[PDB]
Structure 1
Amino acid sequence: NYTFRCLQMSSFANRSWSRTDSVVWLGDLQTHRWSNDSATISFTKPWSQGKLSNQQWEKLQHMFQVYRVSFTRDIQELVKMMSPKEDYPIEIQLSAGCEMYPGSESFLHVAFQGKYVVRFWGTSWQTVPGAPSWLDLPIKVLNADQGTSATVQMLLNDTCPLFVRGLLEAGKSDLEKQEKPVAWLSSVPHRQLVCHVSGFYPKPVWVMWMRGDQEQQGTHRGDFLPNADETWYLQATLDVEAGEEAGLACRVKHSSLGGQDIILYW
């Protein structure tokens, strides 16, 4: 189940300053970047164009170039109209794309000042329950733009899953890459033993403190942290009594290891 996410972040500091930057993810791998400074969408993989021809890509890109300017103008005009009741600074975030299932669903969510306020769903834009009531009229007005509604419906319902199926084909060797974890043990000089596991890909992993074959259910798994080389970092900690560290080991199972687990004895 791959989720394709286009993430747009727009900061409007005052009437004279704003920027919009985007990043695009297929699962946990970045496929695109679109800096405010750049006219064109940048590829972060050799396969970021999917199976689209250069001409098909330039058309899609062109649509987004027009959108980015229109969106920026629209927000600036809206703030002028609402002044002084709604005023700068303003953060708007969009999360849009599609989740690919075997044998898809799409989404477009919008947040204002860090809170989810608006989505596109079905054939229209809608404010979500609890969103500020001042958004209702601008959304009603946007909903009167049939051409925009038809374009968004196409992008979500059709363009997204098609583009993504091409990405999955074109990027298969990267998407299915296996990178092996390296592990190491530590503690501060009752103790907390820490098993560090770094450099694994893909994300699914099993890390457990063991005494022989017995899993120590006291094992607390940390958050998955990214390394800068598209691999993952995780630590698992165990609180133990002093003198009771002998016989403990950290065991790591991962798809890349071919059934040969890492076992590190304290």
Structure 2
Amino acid sequence: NYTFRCLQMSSFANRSWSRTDSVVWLGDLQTHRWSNDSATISFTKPWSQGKLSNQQWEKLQHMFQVYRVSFTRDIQELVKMMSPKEDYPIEIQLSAGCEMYPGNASESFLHVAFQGKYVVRFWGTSWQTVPGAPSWLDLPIKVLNADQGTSATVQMLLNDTCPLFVRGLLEAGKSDLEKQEKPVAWLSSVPSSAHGHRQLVCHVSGFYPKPVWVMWMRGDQEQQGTHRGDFLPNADETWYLQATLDVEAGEEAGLACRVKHSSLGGQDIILYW
């Protein structure tokens, strides 16, 4: 039940200035990096080589070392054939990877965004222009679609290699993907617009995995009205989230924060006093 994604980012500002970096995730833990300046993929985890033998990992990394110098060179030929929207500053993203299911098979994907809009995909055996993708991209993909080797090599990485790799990881990573990290919590209140009604704030940080329950309570009374915000990250790969509640003075007494999270059992109830 995990999603392995490998996001690549190519930036082409002009004929002589291109940069392509990449970064892989297993769920919400980053496992690898490939800075444009580094000649080899760097692991960002002890177990990011999966259950791959060096000799096989090394042979795999060579592929990318070859793909890179190439995709990059071919974009330059591509770009000359860029009418009508001749607009050199080109930013292209590529999200590829595979969602790993238990009973089901795994599901693979390759999405490509041009200038931040999604425009092309690899599908089964051929690369295809997705709706909304500009008119010119059609001649390039048709001439690309004649490269049997690439499209065979892709159907391999995509279909076969990706799941092989990913299970290895869920196997070696099991240690850090199963870590139950405990949260911390503190409250604070911010006054609102011009009026005597302020809003109580509950901050909860340092928890992992992502799934956490936070909510304002009045005794056993749950406060409908509490509004949970965005999950913000921390440098240690943990999470941040804060739930606010707009009150009215007077009756802030008795309210409190109940932080429910997997690592605990007997959870944080921070009364406002």
Contact 2:83–2:136 (8 Å) recurs in 1: no
Contact 2:188 2:201 in 1 (8 A): yes
1:265 shift after superposition: 3.7
Structure 1 residue 67 displacement after superposition: 0.5
* CA distance in structure 1 between the aligned counterparts of 2:147 and 2:169, rounded to whole angstroms: 31
Q: Distance in 1 between matches of 2:43 and 2:54?
A: 13
Task: Work out whether residues 259 and 267 of structure 2, in 8 Å CA contact, stay in contact via their aligned partners in 1.
Answer: no
Residues 67/5 of structure 1: CA separation in 2 closer, same or farther (3 Å cut)? same
Query: Contact 2:258 / 2:267 at 8 angstroms: preserved in 1?
Result: no
Rounded to whole Å, the distance in 2 between the matches of 1:131 and 1:82 is: 13
Contact kept in structure 1, 2:9 and 2:20, CA below 8 Å: yes
The 2-side partners of 1:225 and 1:119 are apart by: 30
5+ residue gaps in structure 1? none
| 8 Å contact from structure 2 (residues 8, 23) kept in 1 | yes
Deviations, residues 188-218 of structure 1 (Å, cap 9, x unaligned) = 2511000000000000000000000111010
Indicate conservation of the 8 Å contact 1:253/1:262, yes or no.
no
1:14-33 mapped onto 2 (5 Å cutoff): 14-33=14-33
| Partners of 2:8 and 2:21 within 8 A in 1 | yes
Equivalent pair of 2:109/2:122 in contact (CA under 8 Å): yes
Output one character per residue of 1:35-81: Cα deviation in whole Å (capped at 9) or x when no partner. Answer: 00010000000000000000110111011111111100110111123
Question: Distance between the aligned counterparts of 1:262 and 1:166, measured in 2?
Answer: 40
* Alignment partners' CA distance in 2, 1:153 and 1:58: 20
Name the SS of the counterpart of 1:82 in structure 2. coil
**Deviation sequence 1:20-49 (CA, Å, 0-9, x none):** 000000000000000000100000000000
CA distance in 1, matches of 2:136, 2:110: 20
Q: 1:262: Cα distance to partner?
A: 4.2
SS at match of 1:230: coil
1:209, 1:238 within 8 Å by CA — same for their partners in 2? yes
Q: What is the rounded CA distance, in whole Å, between the counterparts of 2:84 and 2:138 in structure 1?
A: 18
SS at match of 1:245: coil
Tell me if structure 2 keeps the 8 A contact 1:187–1:193.
yes
Q: Does the CA contact (< 8 Å) of 1:177 and 1:201 recur in 2?
A: yes
Shift of 1:140: 0.6
Q: Percent identity?
A: 100
Q: Give the Å deviation of 1:130.
A: 1.1
Partner SS, residue 81 of structure 2: helix
Matches of 1:118 and 1:221, distance apart in 2: 36
Shift of 1:102: 1.3
Give the length in aligned residue pairs.
266
Deviations 1:214-251 (A, max 9, x none): 11010000000001111000000000111110000000
Over 3 Å counting, the alpha-carbon distance change for 1:212 and 1:116 in structure 2 is same
User: 1: distance between equivalents of 2:269 and 2:128?
Assistant: 51
Deviations 1:70-119 (A, max 9, x none): 10011011112336742310000000000011111000000000000001
Cα distance 1:182–1:264, how it changes in 2: closer, same or farther (>3 A)? Answer: farther
**Which consecutive residues of structure 2, in runs of 5 or more, have no partner in the other structure?**
192-196
Query: In the alignment, which residue of structure 2 is the partner of 1:205?
Result: 212
Counterpart CA distance in 1 for 2:86 and 2:168 is 42
3-state SS of paired residue (1:208): strand
| Cα contact 1:180–1:201 (8 A) shared by 2 | yes
Task: Indicate the larger mover: 158-167 or 85-94.
Answer: 85-94
Distance 1:86 1:163 in 2: 40
- CA-CA distance at 1:17 after TM superposition: 0.3
Provide the TM-score with structure 2 as the length reference.
Answer: 0.95
| Comparing 186-195 and 162-171, the one that deviates more | 186-195
- Does 86-95 or 255-264 show the bigger shift? 255-264
| 1:221 partnered with 2:228 | yes
| Structure 2 CA distance for partners of 1:55 and 1:186, relative to 1, 3 Å | same
Contact 1:23 1:32 in 2 (8 A): yes
Against the structure 1 CA distance between its residues 241 and 249, is the aligned structure 2 distance closer, same or farther, given a 3 Å change threshold? same
Question: 2-side partners of 1:216 and 1:92: how far apart?
Answer: 45
Paired residues of 2:182 and 2:207 also in contact (CA < 8 A):
yes
CA RMSD of aligned residues (A): 1.2
Cα drift, residue 181 of structure 1: 0.5
CA contact (8 A) 1:224 1:232 kept: yes
